[PDB]
Amino acid sequence: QGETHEFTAEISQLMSLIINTVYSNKEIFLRELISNASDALDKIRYQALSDPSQLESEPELFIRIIPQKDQKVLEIRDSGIGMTKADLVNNLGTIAKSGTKSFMEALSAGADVSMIGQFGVGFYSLFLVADHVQVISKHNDDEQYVWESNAGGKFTVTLDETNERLGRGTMLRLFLKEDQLEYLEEKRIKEVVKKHSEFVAYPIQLVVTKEVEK
Numbered sequence: 001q002g003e004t005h006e007f008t009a010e011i012s013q014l015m016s017l018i019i020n021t022v023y024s025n026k027e028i029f030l031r032e033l034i035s036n037a038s039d040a041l042d043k044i045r046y047q048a049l050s051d052p053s054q055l056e057s058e059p060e061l062f063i064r065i066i067p068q069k070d071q072k073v074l075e076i077r078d079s080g081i082g083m084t085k086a087d088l089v090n091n092l093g094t095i096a097k098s099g100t101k102s103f104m105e106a107l108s109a110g111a112d113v114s115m116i117g118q119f120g121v122g123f124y125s126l127f128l129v130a131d132h133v134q135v136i137s138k139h140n141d142d143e144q145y146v147w148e149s150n151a152g153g154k155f156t157v158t159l160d161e162t163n164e165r166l167g168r169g170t171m172l173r174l175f176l177k178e179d180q181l182e183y184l185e186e187k188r189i190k191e192v193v194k195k196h197s198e199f200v201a202y203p204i205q206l207v208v209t210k211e212v213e214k
Contacts, residue, residue, distance in 0.1 A: 002156045007093050007149075011124070014100040015151040019127040023113040026180065029129050030065075030189070031196035032122030033076050033172060034204065037063045040080025040170060041202050047081065057140055058167030064205040065193075067184040072176050074130075074183050078202075079169040082139035085157060088147040092135065093155050096121050127151050129183055132175035138166040 007015070041061050047054045055061075058079045066075040083091060103111070103119035116122045126133055131151065138144040144160040163171070182188045186208050193204055 002158045004154055004156050005089055005093055007153055007155060008097045008100075010097050010100045010104070011093065012153045014104055014121065014124055015127055015149075017104065017107065018113075018124055019131060019151040021113065021128070023128065025114060026128040027183075027192045028114045028116075028196065029125040030076075030183070030192045032117050032125045034063055034193070034197045034200060035117060036123055037076065037078035037080060037170070038200050038202060040078050040082070043081040044079070044168070054140060057138075058169060062203050062205055063200070064207060065189055066207040067186075067189065067209075069184050069209070072178075072181060072184070074174045074176055075171055076174070077166070077169065077171040079167065082142075082166070082169050083135075083137040083145075084139045084142040085145045087139065088135060088137055088145055088157055092123070092147055092149075100124075126172065126174055129176055129180040130174035131177050134173040134175075135170065136160055136163050136166060136173065137170040138168050140168060 041063070044054060045061065060079060062079055064077040066077065067073075068075060099120035103116060103121055106115070106119070107113070113125070113128075116125050133149050135147040135149075136144065137147070144163070144166060145157055146160045146163065147155060147157050149155040176183060183192075186206065189206055193206070197204060
């Protein structure tokens with residue numbers, strides 16, 4: 001049962017600018033997505049200070065980076081607060097009109113793309129390196145859902161009957177552009193994390209797949 005919705009026009013505008021830009025420091029996407037993961041983790045930690053049972057759906061607080069080399073997919077998972085079905089539609093497809101408009105005006109004046117997070121729309125920096133995204137999310141109030149976008153004017157939201165259970169939190173699945181496959185490599189990911197994400201209150205875990213040889 002796929003629900004199709006329309007992006008706020010300005011968000012569609014910004015996605016087109018980002019997916020097409022030749023900006024040369026694309027690695028900042030990972031900084032922005034780790035920062036958003038950290039924010040989501042802050043929110044569940046805040047709720048858990050009042051009500052520790054909110055953590056029972058996934059007791060550990062983490063950010064986890066999972067390259068899927070054969071799929072040409074980079075996954076970025078957190079155990080933050082998650083998004084309900086109603087959220088995903090709102091947080092990603094509709095709200096942040098203000099930040100997107102302000103950021104585009106800043107771009108026209110000369111702003112560096114790397115300041116995208118100062119406008120609150122750093123999520124959309126993922127289109128620097130990906131041409132398609134799935135956002136899998138699980139909030140304590142709700143079932144697990146998948147939100148999906150190709151940087152065009154529409155997105156879908158579907159009950160998640162095909163991905164691993166998250167317990168609680170959000171996983172972005174970035175379908176990388178053909179010239180951006182360096183962000184599947186352990187050494188490259190580590191470099192970017194260490195350079196840009198030193199001040200993060202949660203462990204940043206890197207999942208690496210190695211052949212056992214003798």
